[PDB]
Design a protein around this ligand. Sequence first.
Ligand SMILES: NC(=O)C1=CN(Cc2ccc(CO)cc2)C=CC1
Ligand SMILES: NC(=O)C1=CN(Cc2ccc(CO)cc2)C=CC1
Ligand SMILES: NC(=O)C1=CN(Cc2ccc(CO)cc2)C=CC1
Ligand SMILES: [Zn+2]
Ligand SMILES: [Zn+2]
Ligand SMILES: [Zn+2]
Ligand SMILES: [Zn+2]
Ligand SMILES: [Zn+2]
Ligand SMILES: [Zn+2]
Ligand SMILES: [Zn+2]
Ligand SMILES: [Zn+2]
Lengths: 352, 349, 350, 350
Amino acid sequence: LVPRGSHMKAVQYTEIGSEPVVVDIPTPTPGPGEILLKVTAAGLCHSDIFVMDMPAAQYAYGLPLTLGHEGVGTVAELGEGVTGFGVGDAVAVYGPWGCGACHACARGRENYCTRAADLGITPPGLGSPGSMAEYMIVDSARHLVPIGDLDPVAAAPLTDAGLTPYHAISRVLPLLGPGSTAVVIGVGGLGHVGIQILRAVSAARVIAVDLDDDRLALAREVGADAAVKSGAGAADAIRELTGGQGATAVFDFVGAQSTIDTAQQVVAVDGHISVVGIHAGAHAKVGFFMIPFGASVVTPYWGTRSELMEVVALARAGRLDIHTETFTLDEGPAAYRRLREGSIRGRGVVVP
Amino acid sequence: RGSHMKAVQYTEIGSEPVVVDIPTPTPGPGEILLKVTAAGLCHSDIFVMDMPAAQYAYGLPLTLGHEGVGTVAELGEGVTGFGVGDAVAVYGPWGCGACHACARGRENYCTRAADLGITPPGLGSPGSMAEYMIVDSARHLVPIGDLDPVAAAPLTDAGLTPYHAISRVLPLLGPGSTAVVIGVGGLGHVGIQILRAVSAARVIAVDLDDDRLALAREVGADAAVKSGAGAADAIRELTGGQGATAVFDFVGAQSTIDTAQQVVAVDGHISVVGIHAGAHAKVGFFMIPFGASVVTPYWGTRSELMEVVALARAGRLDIHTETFTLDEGPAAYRRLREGSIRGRGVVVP
Amino acid sequence: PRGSHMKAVQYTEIGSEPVVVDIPTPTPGPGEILLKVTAAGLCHSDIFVMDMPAAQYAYGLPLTLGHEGVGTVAELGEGVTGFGVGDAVAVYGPWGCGACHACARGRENYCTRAADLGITPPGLGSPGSMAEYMIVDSARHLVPIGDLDPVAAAPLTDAGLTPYHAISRVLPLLGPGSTAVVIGVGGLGHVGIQILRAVSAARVIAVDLDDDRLALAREVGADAAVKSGAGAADAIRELTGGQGATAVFDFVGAQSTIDTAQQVVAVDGHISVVGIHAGAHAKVGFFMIPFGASVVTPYWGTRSELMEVVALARAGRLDIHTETFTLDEGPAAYRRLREGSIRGRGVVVP
Amino acid sequence: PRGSHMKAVQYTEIGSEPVVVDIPTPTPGPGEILLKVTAAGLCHSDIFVMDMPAAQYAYGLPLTLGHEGVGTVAELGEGVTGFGVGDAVAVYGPWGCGACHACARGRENYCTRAADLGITPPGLGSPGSMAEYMIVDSARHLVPIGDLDPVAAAPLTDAGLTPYHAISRVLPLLGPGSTAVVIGVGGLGHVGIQILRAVSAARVIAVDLDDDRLALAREVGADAAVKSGAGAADAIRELTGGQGATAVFDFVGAQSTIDTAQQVVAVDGHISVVGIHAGAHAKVGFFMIPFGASVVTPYWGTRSELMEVVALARAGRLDIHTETFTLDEGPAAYRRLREGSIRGRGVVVP
Ligand SMILES: NC(=O)C1=CN(Cc2ccc(CO)cc2)C=CC1
Ligand SMILES: NC(=O)C1=CN(Cc2ccc(CO)cc2)C=CC1
Ligand SMILES: NC(=O)C1=CN(Cc2ccc(CO)cc2)C=CC1
Ligand SMILES: [Zn+2]
Ligand SMILES: [Zn+2]
Ligand SMILES: [Zn+2]
Ligand SMILES: [Zn+2]
Ligand SMILES: [Zn+2]
Ligand SMILES: [Zn+2]
Ligand SMILES: [Zn+2]
Ligand SMILES: [Zn+2]
């Protein structure tokens, strides 16, 4: 698609319960401190679905909403006083914006900003204009990470399919020494990247759990030491491979009550369960004799800027091979339909 | 406001700081202009001002003061998250904001800051010892609210710097550990209070001056020791001859560093905090216990600065301050030289 | 220096969408004027003609769209005086022969020879204004707009002129104590409500489906607002104490709406069917419409009226909302129009 | 070559879809060269052959697909000198006998003996490039690419070469002041424009179906762009002062486009029919086409041509939009190929 003036194509969620639609909205202009990006790739994500399935009550993200919370692009116009990027610069968009000033933000951890709810700072494509348009605004230089000559299509999923699993893993990386076992439940958009991250940054043994045969082989293709079929037999299968020793960490990318249950029955004493996937209602039960002593559970949120940099560094060293399928802006809504039915293999990416 | 303002500047190499009149700055996009409420002095200012002409490229004239507190006076274009009137402490060690270190909150260790020419206020950029001051970014301001400006000033250095040193190794300082603090004047005095507040470690003070030792007692040091060749053996006796987990040397002379190496425990840590040009630890087999790490730490982090204020706000830190006026700036530096300042000096415009 | 060719938004094939295409920059023959287009409005009419089926097509293609044109004088043809280069002019849409009785009376839009001679308007038969340059046939089709913003002027050549002429036809009836009912507070109706407040002292009643438009109507001078549909007739009658309405300006033109009109018009009143819905018509017969109630489908407006619309605008008395598009985005603007998500009138700026 | 088995995509049964397979790794005979495939492009032509029916089937499957092949030399067959193991080479597609008069003139694509000798192109009868490794028959059929990205080079072997040949056939006619009409700005047409810009001073006019396609034409160096359809002949002539275009490269190849072409082509000009549509053909007779305007259906490209295409590429003068797939997504890509849901050219990277 060619740049053609004062408006741009965007993929907007317009009405609750409706499908998203392509619209020609005005191209924004960066205020002072803001940056305008020419979007070069915008990732689709299952999360996008969840948000679009909230009822009139639940949903508090305001309409219309340009979707797309995984976004990379080139610098188009710098707002007033923004130095430290030049027009043409390829950047990835750091997703979970924060106040930049509370204790958490001051330590890098914006994803856990203690203020961004109050101040109404929301991420692009999840409350602020997202990346699935020809252009987007980013509030602050602080939320741009350089990516150099990385391919945008492969870069885009890094902002979430890379960052989110990286963070979860990172939370307990000291535990994942040689000898340790990491269980990755689900080999979807996130699972298949988590596996690679586990290999690149740790020496843990990785055991993948999914339903389809071709998923298990995908798991093997990307570095999973072993692969087992998810379901009521998955716990025993894992205990089998672990010699009954139980796994150091379980990263549940699926996040169903099924999988969380498995995770609780395989997790090692003094291990960790990280519930990364959203299924409304699904929850671990952490109480004496319902989970091993010392086994900590958490639901992590996205990742940190230093993480996002670290993820880009992995990709730029050829350590991450994200599986993509390219779409057009126009194909935007059609891509969503593809996602609901779970036929997109790997991660879908829109390319203006 | 006004067209110009007073400022304590270092104008030529090897001269005294003089109060001169210079344009009142105006904040560009991204900047904040503060009405300064407190500007601190320390020996660091004296150090920089004793660099010879020979070692000199650029810098002059310089507005001094890297220990700055003020209130927001005007917001540059775009700047949000502060309102005019806000009481703020200036974070000293500025960084690029975008490298790995800066993204982790460790701007004191910004790897791009040399090459980009980002110098701290009063050490390369305009300092806090003037009527007004520019801060480059909102992210260099830390709220203090209620806290008295004059108490806040020294925290930005005298507080931050020991805090960071101790923070690097605080995991080691659990119940039963021993911290040695060499030099209990400026940074060490705050150092003991920090150690008392964030740790259960046994604190041993070491100094040359006898009454300094007694005062160090008052702020929570568990034993006193007199610097010198006796110091090592005395400390060992106090630690039942098992060595000290951590030695924070705030003097930083060869003598003290030598003491440090002779008292540090196996797998311990030595923080060389005080600068004496040339002086250094000798880290190598059979010259320091196995596993005993040594570092020259630099200033502190934003997180840390916040934690410092929090400590102060809760009444856990107390530095004695002596107040000067902005005109008395040069007169204050003079007093610092002859060591006739009890506690830290603070200029109040 | 203009270049041999220029971009133009054109309807190239029946059922297709508008495309930005390259075509020769024209030069003015004797009597013609060339304008550098400064603004060009779209409206639903563009959509209507674009929806004519193949069955019906005979000639016309390709067609540079845009009957709502504003420009500045670029080059004058041989023999043309009365306009200088640089002059900002709006283009009079419904071109006529100039020599029949209706033309001579200053009612070109009702020219009796225009069809026989194949005099078609720009954007609907002749090259329209949705290009970098455009040709106007006579100086008599240019109307000075002074320093009025071209973007503000563009919609007036239709959204302004059309409801003006429809109201003008029956303006003497609309003295103090009269009631005008405006059906359709979309494009034309929004401007029409403004016209009624400026040129008359009638009481204006807005009628529309969408409540958001009903509020918008009030802010522009609507004395009262009623929701379209079966309830509307009774509801209007309520607001007039049963006495009907002097004049009903139907901007929608739907059978249902014309039907409401016939039930609410006063005796010796008037109904102006201004919107087009193929086949929708009034039924003017005994006991099926009040005595003396006259019905008409007006067509656009006269040059005199257009000057008057400009003067209203320049005096601050007409405030139509515009969203600007660039020439390259022409088709973009048409799809927004087609899915009806343009607040007010869209205007294209070469 | 390590690994006795390798992955590949193949056409295994008539009318059915290509499927992923595990076949033995080939070993280069005397005079053959074995490549490790760095990139294997797709194109519509692959569909065309898979679409031919059962009835019109004689002798030639399973078939490793892929006629756009790039690789590094893995192992050198007996006596083969001229390349080092590790050398990045593109596979020239139209294999010829190498000994007929055409072949001795560089023009191997028009070899008069290759059909009589069943010499078929790689992936169109011979083992294709779409696998981990492939066999090339002769060093004559490798062209070095140096440090050019394989993903970029692969399309060049067809989307580059084919237009390039077409254009070259008549390049002496494309002097300053000539006009070249490119019909269709899809894969080939896009690259055709950029070639015309590098190698000639001809003025280029693009014709296409879609508003985006026309803007893209303009972006890649078209001086003008008009919409295909009944109107497209006159559209062009308007741009050319009614003079007609010296050359017309129809990359679409519909009867309608060839018809357009016959109406725009200049006297003593040329029409190059470069796209396949079963049945579509020019009508070269008196009064059906200007005197001296020649027509041809060119076939692919010559070896020295591929080399020149690579030189353009290496000097940043040839842009080609690529989308990467994996060997397993091969069949997936071929589906997307059918729905014309792929921008530019698809490339498979093992
Ligand atoms: N931290 C996580 O598990 C997820 C982070 N995101 C962005 C997002 C943010 C908020 C929601 C609603 O929960 C969902 C998705 C992407 C994958 C899962
Ligand atoms: N150990 C440290 O980093 C300290 C921080 N400062 C500011 C500073 C830093 C560096 C210099 C160089 O002379 C001076 C002054 C004050 C005491 C020591
Ligand atoms: N006009 C040409 O020469 C073409 C060359 N190719 C390869 C090809 C094409 C068609 C066939 C017959 O189906 C065979 C091989 C790609 C595009 C056009
Ligand atoms: Zn996502
Ligand atoms: Zn925050
Ligand atoms: Zn200091
Ligand atoms: Zn930095
Ligand atoms: Zn109109
Ligand atoms: Zn007439
Ligand atoms: Zn091909
Ligand atoms: Zn031959």
